[PDB]
Curated annotation (Swiss-Prot):
Compartment annotation: Nucleus; Chromosome
Taxonomic placement: Eukaryota, Metazoa, Chordata, Craniata, Vertebrata
Site (Acetylated histone binding): 99
Family stated for the protein in its record: Belongs to the BET family.
Name this protein carries in UniProt: Bromodomain-containing protein 4
Amino acid sequence: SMNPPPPETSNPNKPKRQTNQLQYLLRVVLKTLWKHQFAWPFQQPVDAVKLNLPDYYKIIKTPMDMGTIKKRLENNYYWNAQECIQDFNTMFTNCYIYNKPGDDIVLMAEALEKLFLQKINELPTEE
Ligand SMILES: CCN(CC)S(=O)(=O)c1ccc(OC)c(NC(=O)c2[nH]c(C)c3c2CCCCC3=O)c1
Ligand SMILES: [Ca+2]
């Protein structure tokens, strides 16, 4: 089976804005996780074809990854910070749905999620 198309990262019909919270999410939150030693399984959509995981997209119907989130921020796809935070949470939830305690990928996701929650707990004041 094929991979699904990756999540949209631009929508020509959606209004666009820059905010301090969106700057923080891209330049502080995403950057911190992107550079982390455990970022690499989360920097792009799960390629279930190259990895031969034909049940991945039978189980995961809302895929999300930091490469998509990065592009969404870079393309001003998000209007509200909460849209972006939701995507990070979907990414982690998917990992815990598909995988089991003790899996390496779960240890990696838990570490990244701890760092994510630390950085979003310092999200700047809304305008
Ligand atoms: C395709 C080649 N590369 C990718 C550019 S790769 O970086 O060489 C590479 C190599 C092996 C790999 O896994 C064994 C992964 N896997 C992953 O990225 C990955 N990410 C997640 C979130 C998951 C997985 C698969 C394990 C369980 C399902 C899951 O939850 C990558
Ligand atoms: Ca699980």
